[PDB]
Amino acid sequence: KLKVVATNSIIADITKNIAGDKIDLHSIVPIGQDPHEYEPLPEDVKKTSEADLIFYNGINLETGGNAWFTKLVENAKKTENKDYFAVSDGVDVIYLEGQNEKGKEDPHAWLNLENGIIFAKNIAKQLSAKDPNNKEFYEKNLKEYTDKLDKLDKESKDKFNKIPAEKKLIVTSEGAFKYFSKAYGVPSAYIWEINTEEEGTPEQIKTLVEKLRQTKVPSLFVESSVDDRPMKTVSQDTNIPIYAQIFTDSIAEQGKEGDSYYSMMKYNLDKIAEGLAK
Ligand SMILES: [Mn+2]
């Protein structure tokens, strides 16, 4: 069976939904861990060597740890677009605020279901290319999976319409909501823009607090994959309660709510809608 490697639990989850049990999947970044700067383990390095097909997010996700993914994929002598593929190829890339080049991209594409579908299309493409036997299975799973996602996106484009503008702000630690914001029309603020930066300096915190004091935002959120101290601080300083943990860089641990791309997207939608209705 096809030996596949996903860099993180999101891509891995999407992959499972395409490949079912037709492949040997290994997911590098453990659930709940930050996929921006990860130190691949020996099993990770071995599985990547043996892999027929490696999926990563690209658009500047796995290029901290000073390019851990690049170095992973160097050492394993793998070739871009032959052995490994960025599953974000195709997304309308959004860039980080201020800096603006290759390495100014914001990686968080998947917080837009349409992009989640693009990922699935890319994942399915490559699975088929590399394992033509199961081409049909994949495409069938794909069509089903993207329907599931598309429905959900279709249903959610409205969720936020009734939120009073001055409450309508998603606040999370990392600025991982740019795509979400664009897709569902709810602005987002944050303590640090991307996890590769210092995380939760008194300055970032002050900046966010001062922005928040100007709002009537009822709830802050905190992602499942970051230290929550900084946001607790924001919470305390603005007296805005942290309403829910949500999912940016990772799906939930096995069995919890949100433990798949689809249901983490569903969870986020729901919790944020409730959180901001409060
Ligand atoms: Mn992130």
Author numbering: 32 to 309
Sentences from the paper on this structure:
PsaA is the solute-binding protein (SBP) of a manganese-specific ABC permease encoded by the psaBCA locus. Intriguingly, both Mn(II) and Zn(II) are acquired by SBPs belonging to the Cluster A-1 family of prokaryotic transporters.
Well-defined and continuous electron density was observed for the active site residues that tetrahedrally coordinated the metal ion, which was identified as Mn(II) (see Text S2 for further details). The tetrahedral coordination of Mn(II) is analogous to Zn(II) coordination in PsaA and the structures of other Cluster A-1 SBPs (Treponema pallidum TroA, Synechocystis 6803 MntC, Synechocystis 6803 ZnuA and E. coli ZnuA). Overall, our structural analysis indicates that PsaA is capable of binding Mn(II) and Zn(II) with only very minor accompanying structural changes in the final loaded state. Metal ion discrimination within the Cluster A-1 SBPs is proposed to occur through subtle differences in the binding sites, Zn(II)-binding being favoured by the presence of three N ligands (from His residues), and Mn(II)-binding being favoured by two N (His) and two O (Asp or Glu) ligands. The derived affinity constants (1/KA = KD) calculated for 1∶1 complexes of PsaA with Mn(II) or Zn(II) were 3.3±1.0 nM and 231±1.9 nM, respectively. However, the preference of PsaA for Mn(II) is the result of the highly unfavourable entropic contribution of Zn(II) binding (−TΔS = 9.5±0.4 kcal.mol−1) relative to Mn(II) (−TΔS =  −4.0±0.9 kcal.mol−1). Here we show PsaA in complex with its physiological ligand and the difference in the affinities for Mn(II) and Zn(II) confirm its physiological role in Mn(II) acquisition.
